[PDB]
RNA sequence: GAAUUUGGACAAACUUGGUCAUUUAGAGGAACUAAAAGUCGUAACAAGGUUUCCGUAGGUGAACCUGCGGAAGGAUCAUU
RNA sequence: ACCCACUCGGCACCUUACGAGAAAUCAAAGUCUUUGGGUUCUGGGGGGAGUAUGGUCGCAAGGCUGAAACUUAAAGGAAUUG
RNA sequence: GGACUUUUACUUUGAAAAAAUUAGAGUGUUCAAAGCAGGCGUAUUGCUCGAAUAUAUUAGCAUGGAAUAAUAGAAUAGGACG
RNA sequence: UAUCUGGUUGAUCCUGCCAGUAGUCAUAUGCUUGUCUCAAAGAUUAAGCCAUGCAUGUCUAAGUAUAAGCAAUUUAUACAGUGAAACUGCGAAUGGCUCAUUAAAUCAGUUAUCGUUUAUUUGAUAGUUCCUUUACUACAUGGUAUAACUGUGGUAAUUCUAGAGCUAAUACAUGCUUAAAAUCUCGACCCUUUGGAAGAGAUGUAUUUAUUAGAUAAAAAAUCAAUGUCUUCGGACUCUUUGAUGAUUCAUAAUAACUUUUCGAAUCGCAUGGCCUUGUGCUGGCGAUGGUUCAUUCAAAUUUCUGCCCUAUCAACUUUCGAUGGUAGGAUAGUGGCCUACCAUGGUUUCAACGGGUAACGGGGAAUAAGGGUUCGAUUCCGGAGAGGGAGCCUGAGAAACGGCUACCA
C-alpha cells in the first residue's frame, strides 16, 4: 500500500534508484480520516505492536480549552472557516489539526455568569463574595467579547482527529486571533 | 530479519565461554534476562563445562527441575538462564556457593564463597530517575529496580544489595582512589585503584586506572566497576587479583611450581 | 537577515506551548523561549532578542544537537534557511603512498541567528532528520 | 553447520625439477637413512624454512624486545628439546644455519639404527 | 449481521508508441588469413641500374608513374 | 671603423671521457640497481590496421577520435666478418 | 561555573577494529594433518595448571610534539592593552 | 623461501614476445589405485521444471473431558487415576536453502534515537470503579453460544461441508465488594464586615487538549497595593522547595476538562493450620496463569562520517506529475517530500555527476608474493535479498511470510 520509504524517488544527485527490498510492512501508510461534522462515527485501527489507534470520522463535539481562565468545555463544533494547508478543506468542512473553527460557546457563557456573573456583551451571600474576590477579570478583551453576542466563538483544533479520535482545541485570543481575523476579512 | 532470532551458531558465541569449535553446530543461546547476551554465563555452560557436574544437556535439565540450582536466592529453573557479573550461583545441596567474577584473562572463573557473605551482591547503578507518583529509583547493572534509595546515590556508583529483600544495605561513591573492577574492554578482568577521569563532554567519558604494581592503563567509563575503597574490598577477589601478569613472566611463574 | 517579515506565512507561527497571557501586562510583550545547545556553544544574542520562529533552530526550536560535529566552507546561500557547505579532505591510496584531493557537499540548516555568506567557515552539529537531505544545523560562524 | 576442519600442507617441491647438483644430493639423504620418497626431504625442509623464517623475523627486531625474547626462548628451547640443536648453540644466530640433515638424523629411523638392535637402517 | 454497492489509494496484468542486448538473411557486396613448388611482370634492397622516403593531388593490368613542397634514414659532414 | 682583455645573452663548432648508452654516439642522450628537482604527452611482440563501427569537424578531399574477431615465430636501432 | 577561543595537513601513544582463519605460547592425536586438551597423587577420600599472545591499512574518538608544508591577522588603521 | 633457461644471426650489443619452470581451499578430464585419519560435493550452464515420501507442532500437579474410552473404587453421590477427540494458550516471523536482483545501494568500521516500536525474560508497580454511585445489586461469584459428541445427507474428487439436538472455560461478553486522612470546589445560615458555618461532590490508572512548576554567579535599601502565617498588627521574617543531562517543552508533579472508555484477578493445583460468641463463622501458606505502567533483556526501524570494479565510443543531469528547500497538514510506531496544498528556484557535476556494463550480493577471508603488489571470495561465520514473475493483504509483538491467503501473467 502507501509507503513512507525512500528507496523510491531520486536521491539528491537526481539519480534514479533501482528497485531493492520490495515494500516492507514496518514502512506502510494509510489513508486520511477526512473527518466531517456530525453523526459521530469513530473506527479503531490496529497499529504496530498492538496499540490500536482511533480514526475519527464525522465527529460532533470536542473539548475546547480557554487558556486565559484555564478552563475546558465540551462544545458543539459549528464549521471550518480557515485552513492554512488547503482551502478545499474549508469548503468540505473537514477537520484536521490546526484548523480554525467556530464553536457554539454556550458553556463558556454560563460558566462566565456562574464564575463572575457580570454580563456577556450588552443571589445568596456566597455568590457576591466569590465574585467580589474574582474582580478585575471582566474586561478580558473586546473582540472576543463581541463574538459571544453572536453565539459563535473562534477556536483552533490542537488535536489530531485522525490519530487520537478527539477533536480538541483552544479559543483564539491575544494577537494570533488578529492574524486569523485579517485573513478571513481579506475577501 | 523478519523477527527475533532464536538460535546461536557456534563460532558466534562470546569467546570467553571456552566452547570448543567442534562437537556441535550450535551453542547455548542465552535467554532474555538481567544481563546481555555476550556477557552471559548461561547455566548449561557453567554446570556442564565449568564444574563438570553434568555431562549432557539432558542431565543439565534434570538438575534444575529438582530445584537444586538457585540464582540470587531464586530457583530460576531455566537451562539457558543468563547469569552475569557477580550473580551468586548458590547450590543448596553440596553446601557450596559460587560468585561470577572475571579472572585475569577476562573469562568467567569458579569462585567458591562462604555462606555468610554469599547473601549479598554489589550492583553498579546505571540510571537514577523518578518513577510514577514521584518515587525515585535506581537501576543496577543487572536490571534490578530499587525504590526510595539514598539521595546521595548518583550515577556510576556501586550499591550493595541485600539479596533477600529488594532494599539496599550500603553503597560506594565513584571518586578517585576507590578500588575498581574492569568489566569489559581490552583490560577486562583487572582491579585498578582509580586515579583520574577526563570529562570529555559529549560522549565516552574516560578514566585512568593504575594497578597495584603501578601499571597504569586507560579504559572507558562504561567498563569500570567500583568495588570498594583502596585496600580492603567488599568482595572476595579470585586468584590473581587482577594484575595482568605479563606472558614473559607467566612462563617463569608457572615454571616455579610444576 | 532583515527579520524576513516573520508573519508572512499562511499559518500563524509561534513557539508551541509558550503562552503570552493577554490578561497580564509586562515588559517583553511576547515571551521568547531559548535554550543553550551545550558542548561549549554560546547562544547568540540574536536568538535571545529576535523575532523569528525557526521551529528547527538549535536555540529557539524543538531540535537538539547530538552526534558528529563538523567544519565546512560555505559555498551556497540560495535556499531559504538552508546552506550547502564544502568539506575538503585528502583520501589516501596506499599503492602510490600518497594522497588525493576530495570533497563532500553537506546540506545544512541555518538559523536567522546567523548571517552567512558564501566563503564563510562554519561548524555544524548533527540533529535528527530535518529534510530529505538535511541532518545538520549551523552552530557557529568563524569567518566573514 | 559445524566449524571447518583446519588442514595444512607440510612440504614444498623445489622450483627446478631436474638439476643434478640437487638430484644426487636428494638420493644421498634418502640413501643411508632409508627414505622411500623425496617428500621426506621435502617435508623436513618445509619447517626448516619455517624455523628460519621465524628466526629471521626475530633478529630484525630490536634487542631486548619482549617479543624477540619470548618466542626467541620458545624456539630455541623447542628445538633443543627435540635435539636438532646443540646446547652450546643457544644464541638464536646458530639456528639459522643448523643443517638440512640435523632434523632427519633425530628420527626414530636413525635412533633404532644408532642404538644397536637394527644393524642396518633398512632393517 | 452475510450477499451486494459508492468513492478512493495501492496496483498486478494487457494494448498502443519511445528507448535498452543477443539471434534469423545470405539473393548479396567489398578486408586479414593459411598455403612444397601457379600466372603476369620485376616495384624496393648496390648510384637495385630514374636515390629513397613522406605529405597532398592526379593517372595507370599490377607492382607503380608524374607534378608540387619536404626530409637524409644519401650517394655530399669539405672550395678563405 | 678596427686591435687587445673581459663580460651578459644567442646560432654553432673543436678536443677528451672522469660520465652515460644497446652500439652508433652524446657537455647532454651526464649527475639512473649508490635507482626520487617540477611537470605535460606517448608506448607494451609483429599484422589484421589507422581497417571496422559510432560520434565529431569539413562544401568536398579527408582530419580528429578509434577497436575486435582472426592470424603467427617469423623485419631491425645498432655494430662485426665475408 | 566565566568570556575569550586562527584554522589545517603530519606524526607518537591509548581505547575500539566479533569468532573461525593468519603468525605464534603450552600441551600425547603413537608421529603428523589435527584437537584444546590434559597432568598429578598413597588411584582408598581426590588435587591442579591451561584453554595465552601478536597482526588487523583507511575513517571516527582521546592524547603529546609542533620540525615540514599550507592558512589568518595592524596599511585611505573602524589596530591592542585601559 | 630477492635465482631463471631455450627460440630472429655466418657470428652478434638487445625492454621483444613466444616457449619452458613452480604453486593454486581453481575447476574439468585421462590413466592407475594397498592401509589409517580427515573431508568439499547440481555454485558456474537453467533463481529451469518437478512424480513421490518426509521436513511444525506442542501440556504440566497446576485452562476446559459424562469418550455412550481404558483400569482400579471404597480418598469421595459432583469431580478429582490414565486419557483419544475438540475448545483454548503458545509456536509456526526460528531454522534451513540459494545468490537472481542489487554499484553510495547492500556491506565494513564507526555514531545517534533529546526521532520510535519491542511479544518473551528480570526487578518494581493499582485500598480509590456499587454512576441521581440510601434498594440499582449475586459478591460465599453472574450471562450466552459452541466445538468435540449423537443422528440425518450431498457429491468422481480436496485436510470440502449442510441440516437437526446437547454440554463447559484462563472461549466471548458483563459485573460489584476493602481503611482512612488531607486538599479543592460548590455551598445552606448566623448575618457580619476581622467574618465562620451545617451539608454535597470530586481528587487511582489509561487517552487527548490547554495552562503551571521543574530556579539556582553577588550583596543592601525606597515607599507606593493590601498587614501575609504570629503579633507588643512595631513588624523579627527567616523556615519556605525543587532531581538529571554537554544540552530539552526531560523525568516527575499541579489545574481545567475529555474518552464511542483501557486496566485495577468472577482463573487453576497442593497443604490444610490457628481463633473463638462451634457458624460450613473469621483469619491463614506454597505456587501457577493473567494484568496497567516503568525499567531491563532478546530485538527492530531510521540514522552520522569515510570507504567500492570497468567505461567520456556516457558531459551535463534532475524538476512533465517531487527535483532542492520553507510553512502547515495528513500518514507512520516514530524523524523525514513519506504524501498533500501553497510558496521560492533550487540540488548534483571534470575532485568523473548522470548514463552504460558487470560471466557483481558485500565483508570476515583464499591463492601466490624479498619488499611493494596481482587475482579470487556462489560457498561452514556476520549482514542483505528471494521462494516461478510482479502486486495486494489477514493473523500476529514480530511477515508484505509464500511447506499463509487473493488476483493477473507463465
Ligand atoms: Mg535458548
Ligand atoms: Mg613472373
Ligand atoms: Mg617471375
Ligand atoms: Mg635507396
Ligand atoms: Mg643567433
Ligand atoms: Mg606487453
Ligand atoms: Mg601490438
Ligand atoms: Mg621457427
Ligand atoms: Mg643493421
Ligand atoms: Mg587531522
Ligand atoms: Mg620480482
Ligand atoms: Mg639481425
Ligand atoms: Mg640458426
Ligand atoms: Mg620493455
Ligand atoms: Mg608462460
Ligand atoms: Mg532464515
Ligand atoms: Mg552470479
Ligand atoms: Mg514484569
Ligand atoms: Mg512535516
Ligand atoms: Mg516540508
Ligand atoms: Mg549476479
Ligand atoms: Mg547467511
Ligand atoms: Mg522475504
Ligand atoms: Mg524454481
Ligand atoms: Mg510474498
Ligand atoms: Mg516448499
Please give the full DSSP string across A140-184, using - where no structure is assigned.
Answer: --HHHHHHHHHT-EEEEE-S-HHHHS---EEE--TTHHHHHHHHH
Q: What is the DSSP letter of B132?
A: G
Distances (CA, A) of C112 to A7, B60, C34, C48, C60: 33, 68, 14, 12, 11
Distance CA C141, CA C72 (A): 10
Q: What phi and psi values does residue B70 have, to the nearest 5 degrees?
A: -130, 140
Considering all nucleic acid strands, name the nucleotide whose C1' atom is nearest to the C-alpha of residue D7: G33
Is B246 close to D1, i.e. CB distance below 8 A? no
Does residue D10 lie within any of the structural domains?
Answer: no
- Furthest-apart CA atoms within chain C: distance in Å: 75
Q: Which residues surround ligand 1, an ion (CB under 5 A)?
A: B 29, 80
Task: For cell 526550536, name the residue.
Answer: C61
Q: Is D78 in the B-facing interface, judged by CB distances under 8 Å?
A: no
Residues in D closer than 8 angstroms to B19, CB to CB, are: none
Distance CA B43, CA B65 (A): 13
Paired residues of A54 in beta bridges: A44
Residues in C closer than 8 angstroms to B202, CB to CB, are: 39, 69
Q: Are B24 and D2 in contact (CB under 8 A)?
A: yes
Chains with 3+ CB–CB pairs under 8 A to A are C
Distance CA A62, CA A68 (A): 19
Q: Are A71 and A65 in contact (CB under 8 A)?
A: yes
Paired residues of C100 in beta bridges: C91
Residues 6+ apart with CB under 8 A from A138: A116, A118, A119
Q: Is C68 in the B-facing interface, judged by CB distances under 8 Å?
A: no
How many CA atoms within 13 Å lie on the side-chain side of B127? 4
Are A40 and A118 part of one and the same domain? Answer: no
Residues in C closer than 8 angstroms to A141, CB to CB, are: 22
- Write out the residue range of the structural domain in which residue A128 sits: 106-151
Q: Are C67 and C126 in contact (CB under 8 A)?
A: yes
Identify the H or E element spanning C46. Answer: helix C45-48
Domain count within chain A: 3
| Strand G near-CB residues (< 7 Å), B 60-99 | none
Chain E nucleotides reached by a protein CB under 7 Å: 8-10
Query: Three-class SS of residue C17?
Result: coil
Is C132 close to A12, i.e. CB distance below 8 A? yes
Are A145 and A63 part of one and the same domain? Answer: no
Distance CA C126, CA B201 (A): 15
Considering all nucleic acid strands, name the nucleotide whose C1' atom is nearest to the C-alpha of residue C68: H304
Is A141 close to C22, i.e. CB distance below 8 A? yes
CA-wise closest residue to C7 among A82, A68, A102, A178: A178
Paired residues of B172 in beta bridges: B158
Distances (CA, A) of B256 to B104, B252, D56, D73: 19, 7, 31, 17
Distance CA A62, CA A74 (A): 5
Q: Ligand 23 center to residue A16 CA distance, Å?
A: 24
Other C-beta atoms closer than 10 Å to the C-beta of B182 total: 22
Distance CA A78, CA D107 (A): 106
Task: For cell 486569523, name the residue.
Answer: A180
Are A176 and A138 part of one and the same domain? Answer: no
Is C10 close to A6, i.e. CB distance below 8 A? no
Which method resolved this structure?
Answer: cryo-EM
Contacts 24+ apart (CB under 8 A), A74-80: A74/A107, A75/A103, A75/A104, A75/A105, A75/A106, A75/A107, A75/A108, A76/A103, A76/A104, A77/A37, A77/A101, A77/A102, A77/A103, A77/A167, A78/A102, A78/A103, A78/A104, A78/A152, A79/A37
Distance CA D83, CA D95 (A): 12
Three cell numbers written together for A154: 473562534
Domain count within chain D: 1
Distances (CA, A) of C141 to A81, C49, C58, C113: 44, 19, 14, 10
**How are strands ordered across the β-sheet holding B127-130?**
B127-130, B136-139, B145-147
Three cell numbers written together for D5: 576442519
Residues 6+ apart with CB under 8 A from C60: C15, C32, C33, C34, C35, C47, C50, C52, C53, C54, C111, C113
Distances (CA, A) of D53 to A63, D63, D101: 85, 18, 18
Angle at the Cα of B190 from the Cα atoms of B186 and B191, rounded to 5 degrees: 140
- For strand H, is any atom closer than 7 Å to the CB of C81? yes
Distance CA B168, CA B161 (A): 5
Asked whether B and D share 3 or more beta-carbon pairs under 8 angstroms, the answer is: yes
Three cell numbers written together for C107: 546540506
Distances (CA, A) of B150 to B146, B154, B196, C129: 10, 9, 25, 40
Query: Three-class SS of residue C96?
Result: helix
| Strand H near-CB residues (< 7 Å), A 132-151 | none
Identify the H or E element spanning B252. Answer: helix B247-256
Distances (CA, A) of B74 to B88, B119, B161, D114: 10, 12, 14, 69
Three cell numbers written together for A83: 485552513
Three cell numbers written together for A79: 464549521
Hey, what's the torsion of the CAs at B60, B63, B68, B69, to 10 degrees? 10
- For strand G, is any atom closer than 7 Å to the CB of B21? yes
| Strand G near-CB residues (< 7 Å), B 191-220 | 198, 200, 204, 206, 217-220
The minimal CB distance from D3 to the residues B21, B246, B247 is found for B21
Residues in B closer than 8 angstroms to D70, CB to CB, are: 247-248
- For strand H, is any atom closer than 7 Å to the CB of B78? yes
Task: For cell 530529505, name the residue.
Answer: C132
Does residue D5 lie within any of the structural domains?
Answer: no
CA-wise closest residue to A67 among A185, A172, A162, A145: A172
Distance CA A93, CA A81 (A): 8
Are A93 and A73 part of one and the same domain? Answer: yes
The alpha carbon of residue B74 and the mean position of all alpha carbons in its chain are separated, in whole angstroms, by 18
Other C-beta atoms closer than 10 Å to the C-beta of D34 total: 15
Angle at the Cα of B71 from the Cα atoms of B69 and B75, rounded to 5 degrees: 55
In chain D, how many H helices and how many E strands? 4, 0
Paired residues of B127 in beta bridges: B139
Are A7 and A37 part of one and the same domain? Answer: no
Q: What is the resolution of this structure in A?
A: 2.5
Distance CA A133, CA A140 (A): 16
Sorted by where each begins, the domain ranges of chain B are 1-116, 121-171, 174-244
Region label for A95, one of left (φ > 0), alpha (ψ between -120 and 50) or beta (otherwise): beta
Tell me the DSSP string of B188-215. -S-B----EEE--TTS--EEEEE-TTS-
Residues 6+ apart with CB under 8 A from A50: none
Task: For cell 482545541, name the residue.
Answer: A169
Which ligand has the nearest atom to the CA of A24? 23
How far does the CA of D89 sit from the C1' of H4, in Å?
A: 36
Does residue D4 lie within any of the structural domains?
Answer: no
Are A131 and A164 part of one and the same domain? Answer: no
Residue of C nearest to B200 (CA): C39
Are A118 and A44 part of one and the same domain? Answer: no
Q: Are B137 and B129 in contact (CB under 8 A)?
A: yes
- For strand H, is any atom closer than 7 Å to the CB of A37? no
Q: Ligand 9 center to residue C7 CA distance, Å?
A: 92
Q: Report the Cα–Cα distance between both ends of chain D, in Å, rounded.
A: 48
Residues in B closer than 8 angstroms to C69, CB to CB, are: 202
- For strand G, is any atom closer than 7 Å to the CB of D117? no
- Write out the residue range of the structural domain in which residue D110 sits: 17-123
Paired residues of C125 in beta bridges: C69, C137
In chain C, how many H helices and how many E strands? 1, 5
Q: Are B28 and B42 in contact (CB under 8 A)?
A: yes
Q: What is the CA radius of gyration of chain D?
A: 17
Q: Is B202 in the C-facing interface, judged by CB distances under 8 Å?
A: yes
Residues 6+ apart with CB under 8 A from A96: A35, A83, A85, A89, A157, A160, A161, A162
Amino acid at each position: 500500500g502507501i509507503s513512507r520509504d525512500s528507496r523510491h524517488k531520486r536521491s539528491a544527485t537526481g539519480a534514479k534508484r533501482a528497485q531493492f527490498r520490495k515494500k516492507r510492512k514496518f514502512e506502510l501508510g494509510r489513508q486520511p480520516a477526512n473527518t466531517k461534522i456530525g453523526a459521530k462515527r469513530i473506527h479503531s485501527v490496529r497499529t504496530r505492536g498492538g496499540n490500536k489507534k482511533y480514526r475519527a470520522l464525522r465527529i460532533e463535539t470536542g473539548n475546547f480549552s480557554w487558556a486565559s481562565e484555564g478552563i475546558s468545555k465540551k462544545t458543539r463544533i459549528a464549521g471550518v472557516v480557515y485552513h492554512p494547508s488547503n482551502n478545499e478543506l474549508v469548503r468540505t468542512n473537514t477537520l484536521t489539526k490546526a484548523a480554525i473553527v467556530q464553536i457554539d460557546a454556550t458553556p463558556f457563557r454560563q460558566w462566565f455568569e456562574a464564575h463572575y456573573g457580570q454580563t456577556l456583551g450588552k443571589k445568596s451571600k456566597n455568590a457576591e463574595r466569590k465574585w467580589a474576590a474574582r474582580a478585575a477579570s471582566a474586561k478580558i478583551e473586546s473582540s472576543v467579547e463581541s463574538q459571544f453576542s453572536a453565539g459563535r466563538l473562534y477556536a483552533c483544533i490542537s488535536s489530531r482527529p485522525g490519530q487520537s479520535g478527539r477533536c480538541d482545541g483552544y479559543i483564539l485570543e491575544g494577537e494570533e486571533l488578529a492574524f486569523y481575523l485579517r485573513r478571513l476579512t481579506a475577501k | 530479519a523478519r523477527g527475533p532470532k532464536k538460535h546461536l551458531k557456534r563460532l558466534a558465541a562470546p569467546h570467553h565461554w571456552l566452547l570448543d569449535k567442534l562437537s556441535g553446530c550450535y551453542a547455548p543461546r542465552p535467554s532474555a534476562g538481567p544481563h546481555k547476551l555476550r556477557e552471559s554465563l548461561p547455566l548449561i555452560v557453567f554446570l556442564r563445562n565449568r564444574l563438570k557436574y553434568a555431562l549432557n544437556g539432558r542431565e543439565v535439565k534434570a538438575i534444575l527441575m529438582q530445584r537444586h540450582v538457585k540464582v540470587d536466592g531464586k530457583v530460576r529453573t531455566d537451562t539457558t538462564y543468563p547469569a552475569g557479573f557477580m550473580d551468586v550461583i548458590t547450590l543448596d545441596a553440596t553446601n557450596e556457593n559460587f560468585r561470577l567474577v572475571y579472572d585475569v584473562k577476562g573469562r568467567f572463573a569458579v569462585h567458591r564463597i562462604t555462606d555468610e557473605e554469599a547473601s549479598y551482591k554489589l550492583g553498579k547503578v546505571k540510571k537514577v530517575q523518578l518513577g510514577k507518583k514521584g518515587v525515585p529509583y535506581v537501576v543496577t547493572h543487572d536490571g534490578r529496580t530499587i525504590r526510595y534509595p539514598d539521595p546521595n546515590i548518583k550515577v556510576n556508583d556501586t550499591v550493595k544489595i541485600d539479596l533477600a529483600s529488594g532494599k539496599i544495605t550500603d553503597f560506594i561513591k565513584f571518586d578517585a582512589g576507590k578500588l575498581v573492577y574492569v568489566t569489559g574492554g581490552r583490560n577486562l578482568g583487572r582491579i585498578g585503584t582509580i586515579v583520574h577521569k577526563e570529562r570529555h563532554d559529549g560522549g565516552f567519558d574516560l578514566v585512568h586506572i593504575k594497578d597495584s604494581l603501578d601499571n597504569t592503563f586507560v579504559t572507558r567509563l562504561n567498563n569500570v566497576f567500583v568495588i570498594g575503597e583502596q585496600g580492603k574490598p567488599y568482595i572476595s577477589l579470585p586468584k590473581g587479583k587482577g594484575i595482568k601478569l605479563s606472558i614473559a613472566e607467566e612462563r617463569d611463574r608457572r615454571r616455579a611450581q610444576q | 537577515s532583515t527579520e524576513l517579515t516573520v508573519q508572512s506565512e499562511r499559518a500563524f507561527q509561534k513557539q508551541p506551548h509558550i503562552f503570552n497571557n493577554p490578561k497580564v501586562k509586562t515588559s517583553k510583550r511576547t515571551k521568547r523561549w531559548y535554550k543553550n545547545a551545550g558542548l561549549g556553544f554560546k547562544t547568540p544574542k540574536t536568538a535571545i532578542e529576535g523575532s523569528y520562529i525557526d521551529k528547527k533552530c538549535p536555540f529557539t526550536g524543538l531540535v537538539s544537537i547530538r552526534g558528529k560535529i563538523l567544519t565546512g566552507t560555505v559555498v551556497s546561500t540560495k535556499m531559504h534557511r538552508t546552506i550547502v557547505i564544502r568539506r575538503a579532505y585528502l583520501h589516501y591510496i596506499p599503492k602510490y603512498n600518497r594522497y588525493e584531493k576530495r570533497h563532500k557537499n553537506v546540506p545544512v540548516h541555518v538559523s536567522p541567528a546567523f548571517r552567512v555568506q558564501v566563503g564563510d567557515i562554519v561548524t555544524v552539529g548533527q540533529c535528527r532528520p530535518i529534510s530529505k537531505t538535511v541532518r545538520f544545523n549551523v552552530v557557529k560562524v568563524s569567518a566573514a | 553447520p559445524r566449524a571447518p576442519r583446519t588442514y595444512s600442507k607440510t612440504y614444498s617441491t623445489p622450483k627446478r625439477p631436474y638439476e643434478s647438483s640437487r638430484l644426487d644430493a636428494e638420493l644421498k639423504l634418502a640413501g643411508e637413512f632409508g627414505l622411500k620418497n623425496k617428500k621426506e626431504i621435502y617435508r623436513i625442509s618445509f619447517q626448516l624454512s619455517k624455523i628460519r623464517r621465524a628466526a629471521r623475523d626475530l633478529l630484525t627486531r630490536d634487542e631486548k624486545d619482549p617479543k624477540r625474547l619470548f618466542e626467541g626462548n620458545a624456539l630455541i628451547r623447542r628445538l633443543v628439546r627435540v635435539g636438532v640443536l646443540s646446547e652450546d648453540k643457544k644464541k638464536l644466530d646458530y639456528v639459522l644455519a643448523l643443517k638440512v640433515e640435523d632434523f632427519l638424523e633425530r628420527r626414530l629411523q636413525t635412533q633404532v639404527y644408532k642404538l644397536g638392535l637394527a644393524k642396518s637402517v633398512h632393517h
